């Protein structure tokens, strides 16, 4: 999970 | 996925930060975001960065941003991080981490670095 | 931080305890909230990931959840092995930066 994102 | 942090201990205030991560058991060129993090003694945890394996897109803390290189290299699997001109504030231990961009149920964590700065 | 959760958080051995997280409509609003559990210094532990799912080897007594621009951690059957520091982290569309909440020491009454 650690940094990600779902919307750039 | 296993990390392996490396850095220096003592530092000397105004002298450049740079650490390496050693990453086995993934690609680092994979569908990953490999991060720094770092945590200062007795305080919360602060991202630094990330790298994106894939593109190799980078993202930064904007208090961090002006200071910090998040890098990574394919032929070494590994990534790395500078943090230049440092002071006592930079004092914490820094950890590399990553994830899988998809199956993020996956949490790879170093057992972290300390970095002690100091005149 | 621009996520708020409470410094601290303290109840009896056997309770449901609730921890919060507040951001914005940029990062809890539309991005996967995470739960992580610590001891000062040390990596932490992943509890929850996209915002209410539960890593496989994570107790069941923990679960997570967010609505709007806030987040929760629950625990419940509390134990006093579940002292630690827990953090919400998330991404912010906005700032393009992951962020974590300032931490919540847990305390175990009694």
């Known amino acids: 999970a650690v940094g990600i994102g779902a919307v750039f | 996925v296993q990390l392996q942090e490396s850095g220096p201990a003592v530092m000397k205030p105004s002298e450049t930060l740079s650490l390496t991560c050693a990453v086995s058991?993934?690609?680092?060129?994979?569908?990953?975001?490999w991060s720094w993090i770092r945590q200062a003694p007795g305080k919360g945890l602060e991202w630094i960065a990330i790298?994106?394996?894939?593109?190799?897109?980078?993202y930064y803390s904007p208090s961090l941003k002006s200071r910090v290189t998040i890098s990574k290299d394919t032929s070494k699997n590994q990534f790395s991080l500078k943090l230049n001109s440092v002071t006592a504030a930079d004092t914490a231990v820094y950890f590399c981490?990553?994830?899988?961009?998809?199956?993020?149920?996956?949490?790879?964590w170093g057992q972290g670095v300390l970095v002690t700065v100091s005149s | 931080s621009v996520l708020t959760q409470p410094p601290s958080v303290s109840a009896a051995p056997g309770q449901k305890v609730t921890i919060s997280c507040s951001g914005s409509?940029?990062?809890?609003?539309?991005?996967?909230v995470a739960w992580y559990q610590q001891v000062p210094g040390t990596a932490p532990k992943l509890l929850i990931y996209?915002?209410?799912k539960r890593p496989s080897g994570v107790s069941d007594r923990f679960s997570g959840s967010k609505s709007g621009i806030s987040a929760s951690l629950a625990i419940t059957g509390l134990q006093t092995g579940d002292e630690a520091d827990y953090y919400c982290?998330?991404?912010?569309?906005?700032?393009?930066?992951?962020?974590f909440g300032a931490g919540t020491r847990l305390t175990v009454l009694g």
């Open positions: 981490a990553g994830s899988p961009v998809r199956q993020r149920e996956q949490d790879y």
């Open positions: 058991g993934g690609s680092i060129s994979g569908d990953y975001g």
């Open positions: 790298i994106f394996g894939s593109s190799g897109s980078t």
């Open positions: 409509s940029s990062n809890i609003g539309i991005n996967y």
């Open positions: 996209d915002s209410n």
């Open positions: 982290g998330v991404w912010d569309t906005s700032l393009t930066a992951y962020i």
